[PDB]
Amino acid sequence: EGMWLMQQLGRKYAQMKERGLKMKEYDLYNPNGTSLKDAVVLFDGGCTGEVVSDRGLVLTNHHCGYDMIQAHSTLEHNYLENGFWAMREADELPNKDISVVFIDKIEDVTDYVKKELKAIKDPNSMDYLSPKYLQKLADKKAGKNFSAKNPGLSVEIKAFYGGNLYLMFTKKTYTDVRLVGAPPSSIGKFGADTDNWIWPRHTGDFSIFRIYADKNGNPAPYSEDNVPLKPKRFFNISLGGVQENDYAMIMGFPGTTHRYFTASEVDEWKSIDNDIRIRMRDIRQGVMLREMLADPQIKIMYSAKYAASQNAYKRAIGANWAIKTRGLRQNKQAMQDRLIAWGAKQGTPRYEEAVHEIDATVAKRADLRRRYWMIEEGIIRGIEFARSPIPTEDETKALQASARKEAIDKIRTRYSKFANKDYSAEVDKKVAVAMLTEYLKEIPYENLPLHLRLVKDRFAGDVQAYVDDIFARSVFGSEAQFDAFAAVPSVEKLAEDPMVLFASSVFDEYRKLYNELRPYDDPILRAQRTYIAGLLEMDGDQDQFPDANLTLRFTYGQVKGYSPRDNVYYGHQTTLDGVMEKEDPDNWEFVVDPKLKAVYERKDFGRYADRSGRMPVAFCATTHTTGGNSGSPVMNANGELIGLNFDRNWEGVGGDIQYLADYQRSIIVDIRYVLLVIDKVGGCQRLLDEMNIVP
Amino acid sequence: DEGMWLMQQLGRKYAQMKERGLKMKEYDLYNPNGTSLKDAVVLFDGGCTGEVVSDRGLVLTNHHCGYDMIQAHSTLEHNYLENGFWAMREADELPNKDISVVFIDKIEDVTDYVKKELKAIKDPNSMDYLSPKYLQKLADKKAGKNFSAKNPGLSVEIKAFYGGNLYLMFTKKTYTDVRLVGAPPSSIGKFGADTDNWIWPRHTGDFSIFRIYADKNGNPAPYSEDNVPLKPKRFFNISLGGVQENDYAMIMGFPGTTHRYFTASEVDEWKSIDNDIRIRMRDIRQGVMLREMLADPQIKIMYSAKYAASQNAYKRAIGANWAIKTRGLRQNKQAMQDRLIAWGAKQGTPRYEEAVHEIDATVAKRADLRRRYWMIEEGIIRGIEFARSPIPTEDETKALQDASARKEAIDKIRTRYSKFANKDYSAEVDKKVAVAMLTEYLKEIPYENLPLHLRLVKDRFAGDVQAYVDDIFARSVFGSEAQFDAFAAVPSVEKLAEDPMVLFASSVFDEYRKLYNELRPYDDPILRAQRTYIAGLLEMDGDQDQFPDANLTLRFTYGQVKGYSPRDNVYYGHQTTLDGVMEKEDPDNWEFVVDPKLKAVYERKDFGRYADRSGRMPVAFCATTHTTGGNSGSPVMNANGELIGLNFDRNWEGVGGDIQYLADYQRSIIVDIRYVLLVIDKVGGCQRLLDEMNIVP
Ligand SMILES: CNC(=O)c1cccc2cc[nH]c12
Numbered sequence A: 001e002g003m004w005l006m007q008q009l010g011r012k013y014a015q016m017k018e019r020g021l022k023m024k025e026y027d028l029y030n031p032n033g034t035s036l037k038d039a040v041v042l043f044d045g046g047c048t049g050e051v052v053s054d055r056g057l058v059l060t061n062h063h064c065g066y067d068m069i070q071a072h073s074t075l076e077h078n079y080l081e082n083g084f085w086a087m088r089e090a091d092e093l094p095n096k097d098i099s100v101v102f103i104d105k106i107e108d109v110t111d112y113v114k115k116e117l118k119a120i121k122d123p124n125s126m127d128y129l130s131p132k133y134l135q136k137l138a139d140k141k142a143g144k145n146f147s148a149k150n151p152g153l154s155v156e157i158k159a160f161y162g163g164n165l166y167l168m169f170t171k172k173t174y175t176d177v178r179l180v181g182a183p184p185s186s187i188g189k190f191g192a193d194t195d196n197w198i199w200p201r202h203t204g205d206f207s208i209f210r211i212y213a214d215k216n217g218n219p220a221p222y223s224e225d226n227v228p229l230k231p232k233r234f235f236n237i238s239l240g241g242v243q244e245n246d247y248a249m250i251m252g253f254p255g256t257t258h259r260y261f262t263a264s265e266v267d268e269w270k271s272i273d274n275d276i277r278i279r280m281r282d283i284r285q286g287v288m289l290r291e292m293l294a295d296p297q298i299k300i301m302y303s304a305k306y307a308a309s310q311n312a313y314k315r316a317i318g319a320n321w322a323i324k325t326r327g328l329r330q331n332k333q334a335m336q337d338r339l340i341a342w343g344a345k346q347g348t349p350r351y352e353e354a355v356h357e358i359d360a361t362v363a364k365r366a367d368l369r370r371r372y373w374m375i376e377e378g379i380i381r382g383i384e385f386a387r388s389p390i391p392t393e394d395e396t397k398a399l400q401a402s403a404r405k406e407a408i409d410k411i412r413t414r415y416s417k418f419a420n421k422d423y424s425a426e427v428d429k430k431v432a433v434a435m436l437t438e439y440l441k442e443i444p445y446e447n448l449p450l451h452l453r454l455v456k457d458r459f460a461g462d463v464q465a466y467v468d469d470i471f472a473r474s475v476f477g478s479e480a481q482f483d484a485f486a487a488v489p490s491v492e493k494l495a496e497d498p499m500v501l502f503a504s505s506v507f508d509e510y511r512k513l514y515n516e517l518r519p520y521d522d523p524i525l526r527a528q529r530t531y532i533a534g535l536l537e538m539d540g541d542q543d544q545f546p547d548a549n550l551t552l553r554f555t556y557g558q559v560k561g562y563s564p565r566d567n568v569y570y571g572h573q574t575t576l577d578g579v580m581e582k583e584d585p586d587n588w589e590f591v592v593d594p595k596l597k598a599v600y601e602r603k604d605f606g607r608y609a610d611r612s613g614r615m616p617v618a619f620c621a622t623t624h625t626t627g628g629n630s631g632s633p634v635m636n637a638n639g640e641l642i643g644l645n646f647d648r649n650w651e652g653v654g655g656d657i658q659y660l661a662d663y664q665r666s667i668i669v670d671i672r673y674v675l676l677v678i679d680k681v682g683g684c685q686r687l688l689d690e691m692n693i694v695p
Numbered sequence B: 001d002e003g004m005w006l007m008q009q010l011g012r013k014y015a016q017m018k019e020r021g022l023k024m025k026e027y028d029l030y031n032p033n034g035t036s037l038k039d040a041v042v043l044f045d046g047g048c049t050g051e052v053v054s055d056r057g058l059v060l061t062n063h064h065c066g067y068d069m070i071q072a073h074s075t076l077e078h079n080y081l082e083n084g085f086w087a088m089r090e091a092d093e094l095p096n097k098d099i100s101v102v103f104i105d106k107i108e109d110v111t112d113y114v115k116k117e118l119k120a121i122k123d124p125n126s127m128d129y130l131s132p133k134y135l136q137k138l139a140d141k142k143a144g145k146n147f148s149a150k151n152p153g154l155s156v157e158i159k160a161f162y163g164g165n166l167y168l169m170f171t172k173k174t175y176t177d178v179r180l181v182g183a184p185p186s187s188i189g190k191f192g193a194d195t196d197n198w199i200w201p202r203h204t205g206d207f208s209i210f211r212i213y214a215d216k217n218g219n220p221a222p223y224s225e226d227n228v229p230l231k232p233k234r235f236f237n238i239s240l241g242g243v244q245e246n247d248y249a250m251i252m253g254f255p256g257t258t259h260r261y262f263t264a265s266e267v268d269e270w271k272s273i274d275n276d277i278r279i280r281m282r283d284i285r286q287g288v289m290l291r292e293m294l295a296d297p298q299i300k301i302m303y304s305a306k307y308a309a310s311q312n313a314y315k316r317a318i319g320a321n322w323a324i325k326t327r328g329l330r331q332n333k334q335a336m337q338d339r340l341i342a343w344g345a346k347q348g349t350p351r352y353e354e355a356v357h358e359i360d361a362t363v364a365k366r367a368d369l370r371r372r373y374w375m376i377e378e379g380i381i382r383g384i385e386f387a388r389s390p391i392p393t394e395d396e397t398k399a400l401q402d403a404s405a406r407k408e409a410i411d412k413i414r415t416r417y418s419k420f421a422n423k424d425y426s427a428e429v430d431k432k433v434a435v436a437m438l439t440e441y442l443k444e445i446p447y448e449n450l451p452l453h454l455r456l457v458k459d460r461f462a463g464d465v466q467a468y469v470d471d472i473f474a475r476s477v478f479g480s481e482a483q484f485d486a487f488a489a490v491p492s493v494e495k496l497a498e499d500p501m502v503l504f505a506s507s508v509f510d511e512y513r514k515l516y517n518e519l520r521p522y523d524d525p526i527l528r529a530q531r532t533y534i535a536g537l538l539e540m541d542g543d544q545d546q547f548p549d550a551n552l553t554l555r556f557t558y559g560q561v562k563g564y565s566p567r568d569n570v571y572y573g574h575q576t577t578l579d580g581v582m583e584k585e586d587p588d589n590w591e592f593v594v595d596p597k598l599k600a601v602y603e604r605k606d607f608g609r610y611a612d613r614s615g616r617m618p619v620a621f622c623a624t625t626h627t628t629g630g631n632s633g634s635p636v637m638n639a640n641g642e643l644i645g646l647n648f649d650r651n652w653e654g655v656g657g658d659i660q661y662l663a664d665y666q667r668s669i670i671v672d673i674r675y676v677l678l679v680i681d682k683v684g685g686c687q688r689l690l691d692e693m694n695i696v697p
């Protein structure tokens, strides 16, 4: 049920042993020695990765190394659709702007931070959560020129439990991380967007990289002289597979959770955040779908835009299902009522006062937050011409020196990016008419961005006419309209441009709402410090984990399926047979790689198939994971690698607020399927040979 | 393969049934010379199956079987279709016009009689051995002179089985006074509605209650206010013990049609012509209908039923083609015929190989014709609404060419035009469907094979299908109300003879009839060869594990209450519960609305003695019984013959079961009798119906 701090391993060890853990405590996490923890990395600032060889080979998800596979791909060598398999270390491709972060040391610095904070004065100061303030304390503690005395190292202090616990992390960062191997996108992204958040899953979501360093294994930027890193710890790969009920554990960097939400915050997340996102994206996606289905060229231009909007839409549907069916609101209400009753008993009323302050702040910001989500979902992300060019003061104080041509060249560059090869003004007008009709129904005239008041005032409520007039008269309405402007440009034309006025107006309102809403975060945050302190003093820092905050955590559970609905059961493991069942040659998402199809037909599964002869693909577990856990190593009871985490099912997305034992699962690619693809699809034996594969 | 067995076959199947769990005595289930459970089974309204459940003639069947009767008695004042109907006294039960219940009184093997009569052959190629007229002449001869007059309510019928190798005579007792007694609201009776058609898991309470009425002596009588409820020979006891996984289950009913003795060439034809054309053509039709319904809420209202009606057989064809592609149906038919051919070669009897060859040759010869027939039927006859627009009759055209009979002809044409262009017809939606359907039709059917008017697309319109369809409506007398009225004011024979819509409709119907007539002669050599083919199969492997094709006659099937795995890592259990109804609840979707009385029952757990051992309220279960269309409403029995449910559907994965039974996929979808009794009790409050049933603990 939790995402535990490494410090909490001692207090959780006995239960983990009861659940099946066989390894010694300090072999997993040692605060003053080498352990399995030293083989986990933060891959490219978001994902998790893991070292799997004494030469710095790193495994992570295909969707984690996707940008690097795409950057090295050309029409000549398309690594994204064909895969990439460097047959020698010298063939491994360097990557610009990549990093791998090791968590070298972790220390509890709570007393230090709390004593430094006492020099306050302002009791409402937010310095206790300020990265700038906490970095000043981290540098003070580490020393004057720490990074120069310990090269490649850096320190960071983070708040936990709403400002009740602080940890200082000593990090070692490597920036020479090279692409080694990747399956084709047909394997790496088999489900593609249709199977996102879906269990059963049949995606071989993996990619292979390598950490490079100088002669002494110290961090160094890309250099042709860099040598592969010999890490102090790497995972052994298990070939024993998984069975139902097997103990499993994960280490990784979960990003965010909201475990200490009040009941009022759950209601707000549902009725504002999720309902607005669901309704607004449903309108946007509906119009996009009609247009993509009717014109194959529109499908090409809008596929990525449609898929990008669907991802958080699906999350919101999944989260609202948990609020409606799993009693999230009620369990938060029970959590706060129990603290309020215990505080009354002890004579300490500050916890009830804290929950009341949160409720009052939530109730007060309701209309503002509704207006913010309505404009953000409805217009800022809903309508493409909202992100059309807005002339700067530098560009206007140029059109009225003769760098008038330099002003127009900068405006043209931005116009070309807005009206790019994937932009359809006709599709955008149709989306805007449906999105603005909904926006104008929900937001009253007095709360409208100034230019939208023209719908009622100048266009007699005809939204279609208003949108038609924006494109007919705007210099960004077509290429010919822009060129006519660029030939005779005046500041008076830009100041009265209907598209510029629309874009400026909606951005002004979006910033005004953001600025007016920002002051409401602080009383909530301060009250959460008192609220979580009460919860911890009452029930202990034992079965209540601190919210995720992109720091290293461990979670444990079992390889287990679940029943999604009445009379339906999803098992704990998918097979290669499931890939073949889903095969569809006339659908890019469900195309099956011919080398993999042949492997399946011949049953060329080597040492990777199970005891029954079926080739495993993926499994699911009751571990508690969230965004940031992509690429996380999944370990056995002996700490051996059995898979990589790559997703979680939609039924469990409400798990960020309340873990769902009967529904929430981590979706993991079986390590045996990873090895089968490297071996029979990539034919990259050197990668298998450098790993320590245990029978 | 698993079987829809003749009643005569119970004797030789009994031992296996007992070894599979059957506990009742053979003659208590079926006795040719006495009362048995078979006497409580009826053919409900000529299609469905039903069952007698009380000593006062109460009959249970599906909600979709009694749907028309519930709809005919419904008004805006008392909407029984939407709220349910529960007659609180026998006198309140509603009579029904044109209803019937047929009991199978006696069944007799008359094979030797029919085969001896057939020996008086005046042509060896005669189809009289399958002729209902001929077989009725033999049935009347055997029953005697004036049998119907000397035995009122009874009738005799002889049917061919095993392709003309076995014949049975059925003595039927028909009752026509069958009254509506009870029905749940449509929210329960058709809970899944079209979304869950052919779907397992299923949560639909598909049942309705009727009562057979008869004269003072329990003899058939048409509706009369003097009719008394029938005291039947036999009725089912209701079991409350429920079902468990692996329990023995059995069904009696009237399965309509199967194709168990198809050759491999007939499976290929079913796939590549019948199913592929239906799939492709309905996909085009449904796609255009969906875009129009989604864009205009008034179009959704007008085309919902038309869209749902087209989707039903489309889904069946997708399910059947999935079995041909994944379950090896073609290969198993090929293995079946190769084995007979090899055995015939050893017996020195080449007639079986000659028979399979005649079938293959006939299938190969009719291929282009059959492709053209399905292409026009799916593409135009069903695909385009203006294909069924008015065509002036020879007598209507004669009337328009010096009398007052011209206004009588115009009134008749107007009546047909108003039925075509009714409140649910959109000419704009029809033009869009026709453009897409004709574009596909014109791509598949060559100019020389086109219905005469479609040749104008290339000849007069330069291949512009949109222009051709636009011109049909712009110039046609049936293109709009104003166009019809202008014609009706000044009607001329010449205007109808040159009308583009009349010419289109006539042309496509002419080609549809020409193709049907040219294809009809191919059925007979196949049928005759099937008589030899099935005779060989029976002589070789016996009339034991090879059931005769379904032909709307009484059959039994048996199996177990068992779920199945539809795909990798997914398992569907054997039973659904009332929780599954609640999970699917959606108030803003008419299909998934939950009745408030039922929702309250679930919340209070007011399940009485109807819940299972774990206090969960069962709704439906599935079984490995072999069923098909005609089995809707069938009684599902326990190992003791007690009623445990009513069959109401089968899953799409098993629709290929009409050709080859699929043990690991095919299931009968059954409404649990405990859920039926819960709805009568806690939703209808109709205690008298529970009291007249014999409920066993
Ligand atoms: C076709 N429908 C979907 O793909 C979908 C819809 C809503 C939520 C989720 C979560 C996963 N998939 C979803």
Ligand SMILES: CNC(=O)c1cccc2cc[nH]c12
Binding pocket: B194, B195, B196, B197, B198, B199, B314, B315, B316, B318, B319, B652
């Ligand atoms: C709503 N249901 C469908 O879309 C569907 C589509 C194709 C086959 C089947 C069988 C049952 N349902 C089907």
Ligand SMILES: [Cl-]
Binding pocket: A038, A102, A230, A231, A232, A233
């Ligand atoms: Cl290291």
Ligand SMILES: [Cl-]
Binding pocket: B348, B349, B350, B351, B352
């Ligand atoms: Cl012979």
Ligand SMILES: [Cl-]
Binding pocket: B327, B661, B662, B663, B664, B665
């Ligand atoms: Cl099977």
